[PDB]
Amino acid sequence: QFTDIDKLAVSTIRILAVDTVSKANSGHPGAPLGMAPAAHVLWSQMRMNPTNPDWINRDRFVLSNGHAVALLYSMLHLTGYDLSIEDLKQFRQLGSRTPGHPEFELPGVEVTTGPLGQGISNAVGMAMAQANLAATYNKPGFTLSDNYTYVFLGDGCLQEGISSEASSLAGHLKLGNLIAIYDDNKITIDGATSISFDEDVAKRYEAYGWEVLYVENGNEDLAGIAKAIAQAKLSKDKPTLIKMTTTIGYGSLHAGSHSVHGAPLKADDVKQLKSKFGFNPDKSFVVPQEVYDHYQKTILKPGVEANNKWNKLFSEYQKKFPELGAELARRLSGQLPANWESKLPTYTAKDSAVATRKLSETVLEDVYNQLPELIGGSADLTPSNLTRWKEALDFQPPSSGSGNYSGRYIRYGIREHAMGAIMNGISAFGANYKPYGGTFLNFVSYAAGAVRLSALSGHPVIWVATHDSIGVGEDGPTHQPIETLAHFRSLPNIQVWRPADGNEVSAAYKNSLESKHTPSIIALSRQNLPQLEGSSIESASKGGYVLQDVANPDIILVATGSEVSLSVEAAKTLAAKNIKARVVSLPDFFTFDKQPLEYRLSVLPDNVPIMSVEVLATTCWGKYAHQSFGIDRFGASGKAPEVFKFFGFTPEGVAERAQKTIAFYKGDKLISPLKKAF
Amino acid sequence: QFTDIDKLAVSTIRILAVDTVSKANSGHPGAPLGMAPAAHVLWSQMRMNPTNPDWINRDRFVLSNGHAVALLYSMLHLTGYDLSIEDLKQFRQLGSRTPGHPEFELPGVEVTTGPLGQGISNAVGMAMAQANLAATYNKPGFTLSDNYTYVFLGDGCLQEGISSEASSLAGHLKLGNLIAIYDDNKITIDGATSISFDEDVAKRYEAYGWEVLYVENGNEDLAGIAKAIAQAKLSKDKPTLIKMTTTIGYGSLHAGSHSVHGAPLKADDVKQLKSKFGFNPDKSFVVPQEVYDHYQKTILKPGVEANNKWNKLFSEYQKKFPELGAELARRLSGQLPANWESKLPTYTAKDSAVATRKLSETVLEDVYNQLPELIGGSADLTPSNLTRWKEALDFQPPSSGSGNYSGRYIRYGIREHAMGAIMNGISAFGANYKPYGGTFLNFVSYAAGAVRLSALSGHPVIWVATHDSIGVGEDGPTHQPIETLAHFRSLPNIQVWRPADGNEVSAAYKNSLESKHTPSIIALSRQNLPQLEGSSIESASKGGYVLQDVANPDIILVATGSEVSLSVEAAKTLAAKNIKARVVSLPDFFTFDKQPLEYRLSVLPDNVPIMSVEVLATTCWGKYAHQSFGIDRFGASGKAPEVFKFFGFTPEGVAERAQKTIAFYKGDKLISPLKKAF
């Protein structure tokens, strides 16, 4: 039963979201205005503690259409989160806590949203991380895990293929605690949805295995909106999409036009709206005390009792189940196990040539049981990526007979972008989740809308990107990366590790997992590389290091991944002709850059020529090397030795370019590419 | 009526594709072995001329599952395209015309495929381009355009977001002549589909507005296949999917296994099935004369006849409708209207400061009338990208009441990756189709899959990417690009234009439209920007040119887009403190690198410090400058002028940095970054 106050609370939500777009004189007013009744209804039955945004068993809410953020900040403020009328009064302004799109980093904001289709896929990830936490820790007597994931979305989310990718996997996985409400407002920026989008969302969703409930009058039916979510909570075997019809910009004079989508309302239109709802038209940012009181009583005071009772059960649990409680309290404290690192593989040069892809499989094989928070998967390339450790159980519904939700290995399908954002949501659940997803380095590019947000929000997810170069061979240029590393190296905040040998793969994993805020891509060879003489975990961990040194080098050859051994061989040729080369192995541009300049300048000093060697785009390399031997045209079908030799990446071919670099600069003093003037 | 030579033809297609894989000792047998019945039936009834692959009214066929190439290469050889047994004997080998994934460049090969979901989405662009051309030029008594677009696709393209995006748009647009045939083989790489893919595909595509037909015995039932293709052609208002079930690896000793997907069949397995199919175990790449003979009568000689009749109808068209005939003939010679460039705008430092986005809108107003083949759109951003001319008509079905199929403005919905692939389809069709579509520069990264293939194939599509930086402002970080141009400047064969003004936008559109092999991205400003005294279409067409010069510069300032203006202001300020700065505008790194070195070196000479100015990542600028002022962190929400000011991008902020560059280097001799050792 809802009452007068529920209706005064919905009016307050509607107008506070309108005073905030108008004062910023920038923003989108229309979806706040029409979704306001369901935000009131939903939020009021979420179990969450506004004083503790981090409580692991809090029901979690995603705004997949994050352009509607004025409603989120209104709810956050009104139900007792740390966001004030003053914060609200500096929406979209430089330096505020109120950006024009939700950012993961604020209290009460789960993920960063605003690219469409990204929120819904993030929330699927979250529903997967819950299902797994429950099956791993919940003991009879101790339901530590059971929260729902609530997602608000629009037409725009539903047109983006990532949502499709995501909803198919979610229907496959039978994720019944994910409840999605969709704003069936019939508008997007260009006009009526019918002008492009006129399909059958409900029949398309039932083909995935989701339940579709409908709310025909989303503008005023609080009781139907409430009944749908009630009913939805019973479909435990299938997720729910609730198709809810609303008028965009409800209450506005131009409500239902695409004009209310993304500009502030006209003064005159905001004044009538206020009167219309019984608010004074000349007063901004007004919150009725009965409203503050309502939410205190219905949401914040219950929630703090809920988080209290959950703690008492968890302290009991740890007495009863010591091992499991210690493990879980560690995941919650965000610690990796003490000296987990010791289980990592070290190698010598007597050991054999292995592609860094097999070596990968062996770190996984040697640390999964160390790290129960590690959950992994492949986008249909498990045999090519070698992402399954042998004793693994698949993350599936128990109904499947292929696994169950205690399993820690997911089969993502040929769905790369969706894997990006599901791992970003699994990471985002907490309980120190460490997701890693495998695919081929060229098709990480299929997942760039997700991969970018891992950097921006700071979600420390791992992509095990095998088949890094023309080493791929016969499959040819549709499958051979050129511009890939160069792209991700231009994106702020992501490690891009291209390990050369066993000990360089173990430093890539060490740094990747110890990371709390920076994603990582590990680019791995298809082909066999030898064990370098000189690589340790410790020096590879500094991101870039001197693998072989000479006193007074004629040249410094800087190389990554498969090209470091070529440089060690090219250096062997050069010595024979009395040129002294130092060989610098540079495994991660990011970690390297984080070293002190004393160290970086010792690796790449002044007065020596530096020529870089890597079989991909040369563009990114001018910040370390003086000359660069790389590949700036697409690849070729051929046996991979034949493809490297075609392009000239042979010992003597590299050596020759080093000799031409020496000759070109002879009698010039040289300044390290590292030294910056401002 | 299918007889015994249809049965001989399906075993020859099968064992020929098997011998090709097994001799390359690399490749995918599975799908060629199961789809070979359907390749036979469909090609037998397709209207095409083997001896002329360019006939505009040819029935087109795309293998979206490009990994089954060997089926396609067998069919092209047998039906009389220029491809031979020796070509086939050189499959997946460096230098051959038979690469491991199909490539646009071969005759018979329509677009390159091998990334999943791309071939099917191209087919939709191709089907639109049929629809459009038929609506433009067909007259009563002159059906010059009436062909079908057939696709073959697997479960993996049905798992990719892009094909959902494209199918949703193809259903809305009602493209009844687009027939897709799904290889329902229950396998993919990891294993069976139930493991990840278990949705009702049929109910999903019906939800889009597609007609779904079913063939239950795709392994043997040639007549069933034939009847679905027939029923399908009757669907004049619905595109069709034929869900035809096969057995992966059919005929093999490991049929139905997933080890038959992408490895050569074992030697003895190859002998058991040649024997089973009544061929000799110990002979290979064997085509019975009767198959050659069969395809001669069934396909080559009829298609030649039909092409020839097309040519006579077209000569009479040119008599009857002389001006429309004239036009289609120009397009089919691939010529652009003589002296079209005259309608391109020019400005002087007199004219108002306009956003590059509005100047773009203006080039569209002046050229669409000149260029009948310019068909454009937006992925739900028409009022933001300003991509529609005022006298336009939307590309939509007759029934819509909102446009028709002769319309030249597509409403794509929020479907960026689909729009880039559909655009490749439109372009790849022929008749000088010049496609474009806009979005925000940041979300072109969502189409990165389709965009790489524009470059690999050479489909000269144009991206209109407005909102090129932090100049966006209050939407903030999720919408401001940092990495985007750096990435796309790392990719071979794509022009990444970033005009500073009127004249620079016109240079961008003429080079972009004159292009026959390179796609483009034009990065356009939201904010107003001043016309520059010195810019000219002639100069900006060279990709980089001296905009302001001095006799003996203390420093050269190289900027792009909105920072060229900033750099002129910085130059006034430096002049006052007596530093002489030459300011260089570099609108496209590509077009600039295409210049004679001799020219480039006059723009960027040795022995002057060069410093680059741009509000995006510095990592690509190492190839032209000594120091770089740019932004390598993500942006922020605030009034745009405050965000520029925040990052130091101010006239006096740029000048101070220019002075420190001068000061840092003073006394050293400096080599221009253009110069290489080898």
Ligand SMILES: Cc1cc(N)c(C[n+]2csc(CCOP(=O)(O)OP(=O)([O-])O)c2C)cn1
């Ligand atoms: C990937 C992507 C993310 C974006 N934010 C957009 C711009 N954008 C934001 S909302 C929208 C379309 C209208 O979206 P909606 O979900 O229907 O919202 P409503 O409030 O109903 O108008 C567009 C094109 C482009 N591209």
Ligand SMILES: Cc1cc(N)c(C[n+]2csc(CCOP(=O)(O)OP(=O)([O-])O)c2C)cn1
């Ligand atoms: C974008 C992209 C393109 C690729 N080629 C791959 C690898 N790939 C090729 S086929 C396939 C999985 C099987 O798909 P299918 O169409 O069902 O093929 P079939 O022969 O039926 O097993 C995958 C993962 C991943 N992702």
Ligand SMILES: [Ca+2]
């Ligand atoms: Ca909408």
Ligand SMILES: [Ca+2]
């Ligand atoms: Ca398959």
